[PDB]
Amino acid sequence: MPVCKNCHGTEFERDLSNANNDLVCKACGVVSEDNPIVS
Amino acid sequence: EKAIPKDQRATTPYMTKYERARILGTRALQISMNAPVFVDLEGETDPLRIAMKELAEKKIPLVIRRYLPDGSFEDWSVEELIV
Amino acid sequence: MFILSKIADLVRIPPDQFHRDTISAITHQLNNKFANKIIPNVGLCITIYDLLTVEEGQLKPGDGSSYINVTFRAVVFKPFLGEIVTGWISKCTAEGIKVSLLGIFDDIFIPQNMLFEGCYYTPEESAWIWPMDEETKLYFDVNEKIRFRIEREVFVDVKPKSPKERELEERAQLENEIEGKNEETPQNEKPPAYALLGSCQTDGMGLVSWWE
Amino acid sequence: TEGRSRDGGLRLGEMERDCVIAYGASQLLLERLMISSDAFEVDVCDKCGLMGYSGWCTTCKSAENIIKMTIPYAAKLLFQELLSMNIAPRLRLEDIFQQ
Amino acid sequence: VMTISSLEQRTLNPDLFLYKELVKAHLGERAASVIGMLVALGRLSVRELVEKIDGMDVDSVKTTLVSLTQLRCVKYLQETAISGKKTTYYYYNEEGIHILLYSGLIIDEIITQMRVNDEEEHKQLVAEIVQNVISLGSLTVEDYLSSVTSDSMKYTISSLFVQLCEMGYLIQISKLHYTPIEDLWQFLYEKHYKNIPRNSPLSDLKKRSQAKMNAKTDFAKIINKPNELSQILTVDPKTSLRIVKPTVSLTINLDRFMKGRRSKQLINLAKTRVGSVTAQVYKIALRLTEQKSPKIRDPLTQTGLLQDLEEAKSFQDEAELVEEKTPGLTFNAIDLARHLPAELHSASLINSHLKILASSNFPFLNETKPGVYYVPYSKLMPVLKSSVYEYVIASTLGPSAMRLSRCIRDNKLVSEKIINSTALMKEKDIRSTLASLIRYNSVEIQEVPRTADRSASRAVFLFRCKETHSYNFMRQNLEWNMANLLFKKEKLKQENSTLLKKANRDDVKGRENELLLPSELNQLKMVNERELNVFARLSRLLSLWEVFQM
Amino acid sequence: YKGEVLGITRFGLSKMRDSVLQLASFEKTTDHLFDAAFYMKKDAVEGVSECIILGQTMSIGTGSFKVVKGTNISEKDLVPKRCLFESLSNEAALKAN
Amino acid sequence: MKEVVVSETPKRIKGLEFSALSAADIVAQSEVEVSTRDLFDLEKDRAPKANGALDPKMGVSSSSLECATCHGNLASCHGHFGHLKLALPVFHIGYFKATIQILQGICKNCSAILLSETDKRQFLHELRRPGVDNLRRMGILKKILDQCKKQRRCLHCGALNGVVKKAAAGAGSAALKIIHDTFRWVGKKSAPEKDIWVGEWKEVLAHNPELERYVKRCMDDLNPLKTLNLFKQIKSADCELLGIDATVPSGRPETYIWRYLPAPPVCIRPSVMMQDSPASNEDDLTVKLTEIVWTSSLIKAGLDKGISINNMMEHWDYLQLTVAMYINSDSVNPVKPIRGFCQRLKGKQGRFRGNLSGKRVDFSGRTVISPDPNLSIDEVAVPDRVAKVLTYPEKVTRYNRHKLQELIVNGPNVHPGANYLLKRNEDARRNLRYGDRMKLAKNLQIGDVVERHLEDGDVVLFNRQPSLHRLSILSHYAKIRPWRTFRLNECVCTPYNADFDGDEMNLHVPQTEEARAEAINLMGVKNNLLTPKSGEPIIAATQDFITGSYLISHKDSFYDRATLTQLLSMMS
Amino acid sequence: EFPSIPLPINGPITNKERSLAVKYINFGKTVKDGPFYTGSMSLIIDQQENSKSGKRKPNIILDEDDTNDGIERYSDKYLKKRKIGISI
Amino acid sequence: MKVLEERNAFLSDYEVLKFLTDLEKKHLWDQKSLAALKKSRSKGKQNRPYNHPELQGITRNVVNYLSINKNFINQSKMSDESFAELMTKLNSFKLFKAEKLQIVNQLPANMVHLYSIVEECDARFDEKTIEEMLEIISGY
Numbered sequence A: 001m002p003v004c005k006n007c008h009g010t011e012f013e014r015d016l017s018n019a020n021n022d023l024v025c026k027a028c029g030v031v032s033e034d035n036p037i038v039s
Numbered sequence B: 001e002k003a004i005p006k007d008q009r010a011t012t013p014y015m016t017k018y019e020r021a022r023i024l025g026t027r028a029l030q031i032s033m034n035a036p037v038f039v040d041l042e043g044e045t046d047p048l049r050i051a052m053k054e055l056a057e058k059k060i061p062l063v064i065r066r067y068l069p070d071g072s073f074e075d076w077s078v079e080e081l082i083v
Numbered sequence C: 001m002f003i004l005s006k007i008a009d010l011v012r013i014p015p016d017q018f019h020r021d022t023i024s025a026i027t028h029q030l031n032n033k034f035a036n037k038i039i040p041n042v043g044l045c046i047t048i049y050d051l052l053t054v055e056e057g058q059l060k061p062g063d064g065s066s067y068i069n070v071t072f073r074a075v076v077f078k079p080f081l082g083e084i085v086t087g088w089i090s091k092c093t094a095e096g097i098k099v100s101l102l103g104i105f106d107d108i109f110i111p112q113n114m115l116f117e118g119c120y121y122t123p124e125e126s127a128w129i130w131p132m133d134e135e136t137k138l139y140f141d142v143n144e145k146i147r148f149r150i151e152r153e154v155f156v157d158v159k160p161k162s163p164k165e166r167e168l169e170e171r172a173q174l175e176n177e178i179e180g181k182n183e184e185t186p187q188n189e190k191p192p193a194y195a196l197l198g199s200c201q202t203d204g205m206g207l208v209s210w211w212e
Numbered sequence D: 001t002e003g004r005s006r007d008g009g010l011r012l013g014e015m016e017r018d019c020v021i022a023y024g025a026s027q028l029l030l031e032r033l034m035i036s037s038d039a040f041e042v043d044v045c046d047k048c049g050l051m052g053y054s055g056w057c058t059t060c061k062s063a064e065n066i067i068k069m070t071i072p073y074a075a076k077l078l079f080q081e082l083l084s085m086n087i088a089p090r091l092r093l094e095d096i097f098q099q
Numbered sequence E: 001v002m003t004i005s006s007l008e009q010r011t012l013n014p015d016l017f018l019y020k021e022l023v024k025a026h027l028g029e030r031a032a033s034v035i036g037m038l039v040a041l042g043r044l045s046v047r048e049l050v051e052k053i054d055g056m057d058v059d060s061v062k063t064t065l066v067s068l069t070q071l072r073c074v075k076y077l078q079e080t081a082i083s084g085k086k087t088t089y090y091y092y093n094e095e096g097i098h099i100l101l102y103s104g105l106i107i108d109e110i111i112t113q114m115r116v117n118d119e120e121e122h123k124q125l126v127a128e129i130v131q132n133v134i135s136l137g138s139l140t141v142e143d144y145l146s147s148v149t150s151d152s153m154k155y156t157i158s159s160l161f162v163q164l165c166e167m168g169y170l171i172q173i174s175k176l177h178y179t180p181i182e183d184l185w186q187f188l189y190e191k192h193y194k195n196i197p198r199n200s201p202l203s204d205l206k207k208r209s210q211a212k213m214n215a216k217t218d219f220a221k222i223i224n225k226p227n228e229l230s231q232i233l234t235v236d237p238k239t240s241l242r243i244v245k246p247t248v249s250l251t252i253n254l255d256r257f258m259k260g261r262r263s264k265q266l267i268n269l270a271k272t273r274v275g276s277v278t279a280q281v282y283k284i285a286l287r288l289t290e291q292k293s294p295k296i297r298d299p300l301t302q303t304g305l306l307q308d309l310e311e312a313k314s315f316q317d318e319a320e321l322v323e324e325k326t327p328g329l330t331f332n333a334i335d336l337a338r339h340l341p342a343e344l345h346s347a348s349l350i351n352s353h354l355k356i357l358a359s360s361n362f363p364f365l366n367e368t369k370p371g372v373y374y375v376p377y378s379k380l381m382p383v384l385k386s387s388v389y390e391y392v393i394a395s396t397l398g399p400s401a402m403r404l405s406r407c408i409r410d411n412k413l414v415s416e417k418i419i420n421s422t423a424l425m426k427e428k429d430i431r432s433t434l435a436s437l438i439r440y441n442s443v444e445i446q447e448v449p450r451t452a453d454r455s456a457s458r459a460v461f462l463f464r465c466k467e468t469h470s471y472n473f474m475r476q477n478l479e480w481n482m483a484n485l486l487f488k489k490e491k492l493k494q495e496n497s498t499l500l501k502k503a504n505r506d507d508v509k510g511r512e513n514e515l516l517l518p519s520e521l522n523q524l525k526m527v528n529e530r531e532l533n534v535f536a537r538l539s540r541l542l543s544l545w546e547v548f549q550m
Numbered sequence F: 001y002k003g004e005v006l007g008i009t010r011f012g013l014s015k016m017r018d019s020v021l022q023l024a025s026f027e028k029t030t031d032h033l034f035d036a037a038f039y040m041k042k043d044a045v046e047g048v049s050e051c052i053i054l055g056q057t058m059s060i061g062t063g064s065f066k067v068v069k070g071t072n073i074s075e076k077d078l079v080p081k082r083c084l085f086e087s088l089s090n091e092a093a094l095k096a097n
Numbered sequence G: 001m002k003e004v005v006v007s008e009t010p011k012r013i014k015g016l017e018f019s020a021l022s023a024a025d026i027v028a029q030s031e032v033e034v035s036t037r038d039l040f041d042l043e044k045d046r047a048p049k050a051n052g053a054l055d056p057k058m059g060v061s062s063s064s065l066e067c068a069t070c071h072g073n074l075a076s077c078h079g080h081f082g083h084l085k086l087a088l089p090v091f092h093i094g095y096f097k098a099t100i101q102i103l104q105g106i107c108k109n110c111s112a113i114l115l116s117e118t119d120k121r122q123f124l125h126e127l128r129r130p131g132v133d134n135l136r137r138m139g140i141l142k143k144i145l146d147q148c149k150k151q152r153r154c155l156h157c158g159a160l161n162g163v164v165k166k167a168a169a170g171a172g173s174a175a176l177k178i179i180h181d182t183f184r185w186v187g188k189k190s191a192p193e194k195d196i197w198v199g200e201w202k203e204v205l206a207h208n209p210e211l212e213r214y215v216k217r218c219m220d221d222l223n224p225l226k227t228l229n230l231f232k233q234i235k236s237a238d239c240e241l242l243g244i245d246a247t248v249p250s251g252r253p254e255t256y257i258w259r260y261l262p263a264p265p266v267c268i269r270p271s272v273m274m275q276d277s278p279a280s281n282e283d284d285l286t287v288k289l290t291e292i293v294w295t296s297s298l299i300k301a302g303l304d305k306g307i308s309i310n311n312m313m314e315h316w317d318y319l320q321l322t323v324a325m326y327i328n329s330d331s332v333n334p335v336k337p338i339r340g341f342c343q344r345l346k347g348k349q350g351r352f353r354g355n356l357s358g359k360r361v362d363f364s365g366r367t368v369i370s371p372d373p374n375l376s377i378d379e380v381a382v383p384d385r386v387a388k389v390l391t392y393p394e395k396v397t398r399y400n401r402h403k404l405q406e407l408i409v410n411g412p413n414v415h416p417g418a419n420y421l422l423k424r425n426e427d428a429r430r431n432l433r434y435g436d437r438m439k440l441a442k443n444l445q446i447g448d449v450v451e452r453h454l455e456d457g458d459v460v461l462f463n464r465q466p467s468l469h470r471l472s473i474l475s476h477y478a479k480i481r482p483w484r485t486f487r488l489n490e491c492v493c494t495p496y497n498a499d500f501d502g503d504e505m506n507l508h509v510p511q512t513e514e515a516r517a518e519a520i521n522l523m524g525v526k527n528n529l530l531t532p533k534s535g536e537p538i539i540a541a542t543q544d545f546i547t548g549s550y551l552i553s554h555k556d557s558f559y560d561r562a563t564l565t566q567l568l569s570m571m572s
Numbered sequence H: 001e002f003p004s005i006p007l008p009i010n011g012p013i014t015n016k017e018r019s020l021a022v023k024y025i026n027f028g029k030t031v032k033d034g035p036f037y038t039g040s041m042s043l044i045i046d047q048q049e050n051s052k053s054g055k056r057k058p059n060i061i062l063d064e065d066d067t068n069d070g071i072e073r074y075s076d077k078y079l080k081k082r083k084i085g086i087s088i
Numbered sequence I: 001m002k003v004l005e006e007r008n009a010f011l012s013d014y015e016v017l018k019f020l021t022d023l024e025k026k027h028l029w030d031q032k033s034l035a036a037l038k039k040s041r042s043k044g045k046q047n048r049p050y051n052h053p054e055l056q057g058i059t060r061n062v063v064n065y066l067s068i069n070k071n072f073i074n075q076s077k078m079s080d081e082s083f084a085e086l087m088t089k090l091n092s093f094k095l096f097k098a099e100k101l102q103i104v105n106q107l108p109a110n111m112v113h114l115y116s117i118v119e120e121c122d123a124r125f126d127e128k129t130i131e132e133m134l135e136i137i138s139g140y
C-alpha cells in the first residue's frame, strides 16, 4: 500500500472522470501500480 | 541463403502498395525515435506526413528484402524501384 | 592484456544515432557494451580494436531500431602459462597475502603453496619475513613491487541465485543498516573468474630467481 | 469487461479481425490484439522450454537459458489451462537476425 | 522435491535403461547413445543414427560400431530391397549385454565346479586367459600367446583350451551368430518356398507342412552346427599330440554356463527340499547331467511362429521328446562312482547312492523309471519359478500374503467369501493383505453384471490367477532394481572421481605409507566398502532376476 | 489439390492442414488437441490463425518480407591493422624448433 | 570492477511441440504437495497457510494478500502448479479412444505389438518417409489398426487375443470399463484357455451353481492397475508403430494414465470475495480439486486400514467418474453443469472463440451516428466528449517539442491537451491534472511517451460489428465537433449498410506509429473505392445527391448568372 | 519411502563375495581402459561377409587403443625439453 | 556474443601504447579543466563524449600501468627507432616466443629478469648468450 517513488506513505484516490479509475497518489502524481483489476 | 546478384532479379520492379504501407510506417516510427529527416519541413510535425514528404523527394535510406520460398531474398533498393 | 582475440556480436544501435556514421556507432556500442565484462572461457576486456566484414543489418518490425550483426577482434585478458608480471602489495592477512595492482583486477589471492616459510600473521607491521637462515634475512613492507608466477585460467563463475535466496538477501540487507557487529553478508562475495597462485615474491629488491 | 456497466469493452474478432486479414494489414492486427490488449513477459528456454517465473523454468534447474520475450496474456492463460491437465506444449526458439 | 527423492529416474523407462546403462560404465561417452537410439527405435540403418544423434558425423559412429560388433551388443544385416545399395541394417543384440552383466560371476563360478584341470594356485592365469577373451571378443593363439615369451606353459594353456572347449563355452567357428534369429527363419522359409513352382495344386497342408518341415530341419542343423564341432584336428604333426588350430577366430560364453547356473539354482531348490544327502548326491549327478541338456533360449520358437495350431503342441512335444532322445545320458550309480566324492551310513557308498537316487521322487524332481537311464525336466523349472516367486512374495510382507497367493493358486480361482474358511482372521487383515497384494498386478479382479449394467455396487467379485503377467512384472521389476542400483553406483563413481584417480596414478608403490592424509584414507575405505556392498547386493539381485528368465 | 474433393466441413478441414491450432479452433475443439498430443505432432507455427495466438507477424499481407536498412559500408572497415609483432612469428618462431 | 554483462538476443517462437506430461517432471514444477486432507482449505476464518486447496505458495487473486516466491500480487505472480499423490490409478477420459487403440494393438500376455516381422519392417519403412502429411500418418496408422483386430492369436506367446471394446453401450459414463473378450473369435478350437475357462466354473457347489446359472459371462475388465503394468512391458522396438516415438523421456504410454493430478494455480482460477452478501464464492474447480483430494485420502486410509472390496470399488469408481467429469465434462450428470478444462475451450464463450481470437480491445467508443455532407470522405467526426477520453501516444522527437509543450501547459480539461506522461526514468504513469503543470513543462527529455487527446488530422479506425465483407474497417481521420453523436459522411454509407435508425457503430484508434500509417496507407477511404467482388465503385454518393443532381442537370434547368454564380461558389 | 525388504543381505566376511567383487573391479579396470595391445588386428581382419565394416576396420587399425599413453609421454618429454603454446 | 577464435594475434608494447594513445586522443592529451572552464572548444568536442557509464576507467587505468614498470632499486619512454630495431635485432638464435613477450614487456635491469624469464637457462643452453644478448637494453 505505501509503495511509491517520489513520496512515501501518502493517501490515495481512484479517479472519477475519464472512465479510468486508477489508484493514484497526491502532490506529484504517480499511478505507482498497474491498471486496476476488478471482478 | 544464396546472395543472388543484380543480374537475375526475378521479380517485377513495380511497387506493391503493401511495400509502401510498410515503408511509410517504418519511416514514421524511425522519425518518432528521433531520426533526422532528409526533407525541408514547414514548421509542422507529423511523422506520417513528413514520411509522405520524404517519399515525394525519394530520400528513404532503406532497402527491400523481398522473400522467395527457396531463400533468395532478392535485395531491392528504394531509389532504383518503379513506383 | 596481450591478445587481439576475435569475437562476434549482435549490435543494437539506437535510431537517433543514424546521423553518425556506422564505424563510430558500432565502436560506441561495443565500447560501452564490452568495457569490463569477463566473458566465460575468454576473460576481461578493456576496449575494441576495429571492425571486420560487417554486412547489412536487419530491422525488427516490433521495435524499429536497427539491428546490425558484426564480427571483430578485441583485446581480452589471456596471459601465457608462464607469465611473470609485477604488481605491488596493498593488503595483509594471516593465511595468505594477496598482491594488488593499479586497477585491472583485485582478487588474485594466493593459496598456501609451499614457499618454504610463513608465520601466523603480521606481528611488527611486516607482512612476510623471509629469514632463510642464515642468508638474506630481509623483508618487505607495503608498496613493494612483487612479481608472481601465474597458474592456469581458473574461471569458475556460477549463478546459483534462486529468488528464495534473493529474498533471504533482501532480509539480510536490513542486517546492514544498524547493528554493532553484523559482518555476515559483505564478506561473502562471488570471486570473479580468478583464484590465482604465486610461487615467488622477490622479498624486496635483493632476490633473483630462486625457489621457482 | 463487457457492456457499459462495469467500465465497458468493445470486442473485435471472429468475423472482424478477418477483415484486416482480407486487407493484408499485418502490424495493426498484431498490435491491436497483442500490445493494446495485454503485453506479458513469459520466460522461455531452449532445453525443455516451458514457462517459469522470471528466474527459472522449474522443470530444469539452470537459471541461465531464460529469454524474457513478449506474448499476449491470453496465450499464457491457454498454456496454463492447457498443460494443467495432461499435455506438454513446448516452445522452441528460432533466431530472428543471423542466417 | 529437491531431486534427492530420486524420482527423475524412478517412474520412467524400465527396460530401455539397463541395456545402455551398463555401457555407460563399460564403454564410455559415445558408444552408449548408439545403443540408446538403437534399442529405442529398433531397426536402424547407417545414416539414420547420424541424422538422429547430433554428436558427430559418420566418422566416429564407425568407431562405436566396430567397438560393439565383436562385443556382440549389436548384430548386423546386409540386404537390399529390389535394386541395390547393399547397406548394413542393424538390429540390437542381447547376448553380449548379458555377457557384460554376467562376466565376473562367470569367471568366479566356473572354477569350483566345471573346470577341474588344476587348483595349485592357477588363479594368476585364469583371469589372464579368460578376461582378455571377454574384453576383446576373439581368440587367435598366434597373436594372443605372442605376448607370453615362455614356451613351457604353452602346452598347459593348450590343454586348458582343449578341456574348456570340450564343455562348450567358446563358439568355435564363430560365424552366423551376428544374424537375427527371425531373419534366419524367414530366409530359410523363403528359400524353401522358392524351390517348388509348377506342381500339383497347392493347399495349406502341403505347402505349409513341406516348407515348415524343411525349414525346421535346416534351421536345426544350422543351430546345431556351432554346438558340436571338430576343428581341433591334425594331431601330432611334429609335436603337441592335442593342439587347437590358431587360424579360426574363437568367441566366448556359449549359454551352457547359463544352463549350469540354473542348474545351481535347481540344486539350491533340491537342497532346501527333502534329503540334503539328496543334495550332496544330486549336485554331482546334475553337474554331469547338464552338459548335454536342451538349451534354455529354445530356438525354432524365438521367431514368431508360435500360433494356436499344430505348431504350438509340437513345441511341447519337442520339449518332451528331444530331452529324452538327444542326450541319452545312461546314468546309474556305477556311472556316479567314477566321479565319486571324497568321504561324502558313511560306508557302503554305492547301495546308499542307489537308495538316495531312488528316493528322490514324487514331487516332479528326478522323474524315474523301473531301471531308469535318464532324467527329464519339463514340469520342474516352472515349479522352481513359482516357488522362488512365492518365497519372494513371502519376503515382501509376512507369511499371510504368501498363504493367500498360494491358496488362490491352489483352490483353482475361487471367489472371496470362501477365503475366510481357509484363513485365520475374519475380515480386517485379509482385506489388508489383499489390498497390499492388489497394489501389485499379480492377483486380478473379475466383474460380472447383475442387471446387465456396469455398477460398482451391485457386483460379486472373484480373483483370477494370471501367473505369467506376474512373472513378467517381477522380471521387469528385478531388471529395474538392477538398473537403479548400477545407476546409483555410477553416480557414486562420478561424484568421487578425482580422489580415486589421484591414488590410482602413482601411489601404487606407496600404498603402504599411503602417501596422503588420514581423512581421505577413511574416505577411500568408506567408498570401497560402498562399492563392495553394491556389488554384493548386485550379485544376489542378479541371481534373483536370473531365476525369472524363459 | 490434395487429390480428392475435400469439404469445408469439420471432417474436410480436419484434413489438408498441419497447424493444429486452426485444426482445433474451427468446429470441434474437444480432442483435436488430444489427437495432436497423443501422436505428438511437431507443428511449425508459420501461418495466420496460429500466429494471432502466439502474437507474431504473419507471412501474408504486409509481413511477406522483412524490411532491412542498408549499412553503406564503403569497403574501408573490412581491412584490419596488423600489430608490429606478427612478422616476428614468421621470422624467429620456427627457427630450428 | 567486475560488472559482468551477459548479452541478450531476440528470439522468435518457431514450432509447437505437443507431448504429454511425463509424471516425473510434474514433481519438478511442484512447489507444493497437497495430499494432506485439503477439505480444510480455509484457516478457520481466513485464507490458509498449509498445503490445502488454496495456498500462499501458489500465488494470489486478491488485493492485499501476499503470495509465493515472487512477493508481489496477482499482477506480478505468474502462477505455480502442484502435483497430487494417488493410489489405484485412473484412466484419462480425453485419451480414452486412444487408450482403446493403444490397448487393442497390444496383446495381453507378453504385451507385444502383434505383427509379422516382415510386415513390421514394411510399415516402419513406409511410415518413416520424408514426404509425410497429417493425412498420411492417420491413413497409415488407421490402416495398420485393423490387422491387430483381425488377427486371432498372438505372435510369440502361448495364448490368443480378441476384441477390445467399451463395456456394453454406455454414453452416461457408467460403462467406462475396458473389456478384452478373449472368446468370440475362436469358434470350436484352441482348447487350453477355453478348457481352464470352462473348468474354473465347475469346481464350486456353493455359489457357482447359481452364478453360472445367472450371469454365465464375464468379459474381464481391464482396470488401470492391470493397464498401467501392461503398458510397462511395452518394449520400444515396436512402440513407434502406434504413433508415439521413444526418443523423448515423455514418450511412454505409462504417462497416459493419471498417476498425478496437476493442481492448477490460484492465479488462473478466481478466488472471488463476497458479492453483495457476506459469503465467499468457493470456486467450482477448487471444490472439485478438494473433493478429489478427499476421496484419494479416503482410499489411502481405507486400503491399508482394511474395508470391503465392493465399497472400495464403488468409491474408486467414483474417483474414476469425478476426474472424468472434472475434465471433459457433460458426459455424465448423476445451473448444474460444472465447468472444467473443456467448457473453457468449447466455443463462443471459451478461450478459442471470444477470449483469444476475438478479444475485447482497449481505446474504443460506441455512439449513434448522424449524417453530415460537409465533411470529406476521409474523416469521422469524433466529438470531444469521447475524444478527451481517447488518447494517442506521441514520443517527442525534437520537432514537436513546442507543440507537446503547448498541450502540456494547456491542460487535460480543454481539448488540445494531454492526460498522462512518462519520462525517460522508470515511473509508472505521471499524471497532469493532479501534480504540477508549470514545472513539468520545462525539461521535456526526448524519451517521453506522452498521451495527448485525439486532435484533428489523426487517423482513426471505424467499423460495424456485423461485418459481412472486407470494406468494414476503413481508416478515417479525426474531426472535432460538438453534439456527441457521430458523423462520418453519407457517400460511404453503402459498405457500412447503415440506416440511421438508432444504429450504433463503434470506432477504434491505432497506437504505435507503425500501425497508424499501416491503417491510412492500406485501408484509406481514397484507396478503397472498390469492392473486390467485381471491381465496381461502391462509394460514390447516396439518394439525395443523385436525385438532386438529376434535378440540376435534367434538360431544362437554365440558370441565371446570379444563380449559376451562387451554385458554382457553393461547392468548393 | 520404503516399507518392504527384498532380502539383499551383505555377508562381506565370506571369501567368495570378496573375490567376486574384486574380479568385478578388475573387469571394470580392463574394460574402462579400453582395448589392449596389438591383438585386435584379428578383430579387424575377421571380416566374415562385410564390405562396409571391412572398410571400417582397416580405417581404425590405428585407433586410440594403447598408443595414447606413449604419445602423452612423448608430449610430456617434449614439454620438459622445450616450451610450446597450446591449450590444456 | 559467440566466440570464433581464441588467439588470433597476441600484442605487446609501444605500438599498442600508441593505439591506446590514439584512443585517448578523443578528448585531449591531459587537459580536463581548461576545456571545462572555457566557452565552447567546439562545444567541448561535441558535448562530452562516450565516457559516461564506465569508460573513464579503461585505458586510463592501464596507460599508467604500461608506462612505469621498470622495477629498479632506487629512491619511461619508447619510440619508433627503439622498437623497429628491437623487433629485428633480437631475432638471432633458437629462442621461444613468450620469452620475447616478457622481454618487450619488461626490461631486465642487469641479470635478474633475464634469469627469471629464461627457464632452463643453464640446463638446456650453454654460456655467453646471457652476456652478449643483453646490451640492447639501452634502447629506450
Ligand SMILES: [Mg+2]
Residues within 6 Å of the ligand: G498, G499, G500, G501, G502, G503
Ligand atoms: Mg439498422
Ligand SMILES: [Zn+2]
Residues within 6 Å of the ligand: A004, A006, A007, A010, A025, A026, A027, A028, A029, A030
Ligand atoms: Zn506521490
Ligand SMILES: [Zn+2]
Residues within 6 Å of the ligand: D045, D047, D048, D049, D050, D056, D057, D058, D059, D060
Ligand atoms: Zn526450462
Ligand SMILES: [Zn+2]
Residues within 6 Å of the ligand: D053, G058, G059, G067, G068, G069, G070, G071, G077, G078, G079, G080
Ligand atoms: Zn509467486
Ligand SMILES: [Zn+2]
Residues within 6 Å of the ligand: G107, G108, G109, G110, G111, G112, G154, G155, G156, G157
Ligand atoms: Zn502375447
